[PDB]
Amino acid sequence: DDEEETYRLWKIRKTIMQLCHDRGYLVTQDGLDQTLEEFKAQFGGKPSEGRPRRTDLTVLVAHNDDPTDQMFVFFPEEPKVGIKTIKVYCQRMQEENITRALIVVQQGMTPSAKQSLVDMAPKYILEQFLQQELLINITEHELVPEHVVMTKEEVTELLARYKLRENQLPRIQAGDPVARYFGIKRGQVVKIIRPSETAGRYITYRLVQ
DNA sequence: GAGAGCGGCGGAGCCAGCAGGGAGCTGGGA
Incomplete structure (x- = not known):
């Protein structure tokens, strides 16, 4: 249901915040503890044909020691992430000049895309995360x-x-x-x-x- | 010819292997 998927987005954002805190990056306390009502007020209540469209959920975080580490997270639109989407994300990574990112795939990406993640590995760090994995x-x-x-x-x-x-x-x-x-x-x-x-x-x- | 010596005539559980099915690029024509 729409309420269930809104809960899914809120819970996965909470898991991303906890992961970014545990990795050593800087997150705010209120960002760490957001309620369902507060998340709905901030981002929208009905994501299907509505305001939270999985694009405005990207997060800017930076490391505690170095303010120029600048790690992002990305929520792709399509369930099957491919070379085109990953190329768009990596080109965007190139103009905002960051080195590390997370990709939160809905169900799974193509084998060519997950191989392209390995090919792109030295200059840019790309990690694949399923939406089912990050639900808890x-x-x-x-x-x-x-x-x-x-x-x-x-x-x-x-x-x-x-x-x-x-x-x-x-x-x-x-x-x-x-x-x-x-x-x-x-x-x-x-x-x-x-x-x-x-x-x-x-x-x-x-x-x- | 006898003696004889050798010639021939059940069950259970990890790997390999193939087969079918999508991404994805490429030449042809819009």
Whole structure:
């Protein structure tokens, strides 16, 4: 229904705000907690043949340390995102001169488009996200523990302390849902803190490789 | 010819493999 799809847009915007906050970017508190009525007042009440048309939902955020990181998110119109739409989005990325973006696909993009995302990867970072994936925050589940992204100096200090190579660490795939949530890439180490039945707290390090 | 020696005559669960079905570019004509 129209009310259901309005709820869907509000919830997915809340998940985008939580993801951008967890990735280290700057979001406002009221942007973090928007109600359904407040979202409807801000963007429109009936999106079908109405005001919120999935184009005005793009978000400008910047990193806390660097105000020129300038990450956007995009909500494509068509359910099947293709090379034409991705080329339009990347050309737009070129004139506003930003490097990183998120694409929130309705159902799925074409294999040629998802390959073009890999081909465009060095200069511009493009990530595919389904609307079904972002309908809930997976980091709030009781099974999922806390994930902390480590800096390069911290990783170097860790490997010097334990006298380890990068191969000897446990691994996590780049296609992992938490890895895609944090936007981690190959070669980085994620730090997992979980409660322990026997010791109380246990810390595990995993290499994204 | 006898002795004989060798010649021939069930079930369960991961991979490969093909087949059918859309994007997407390209030559032809509007």
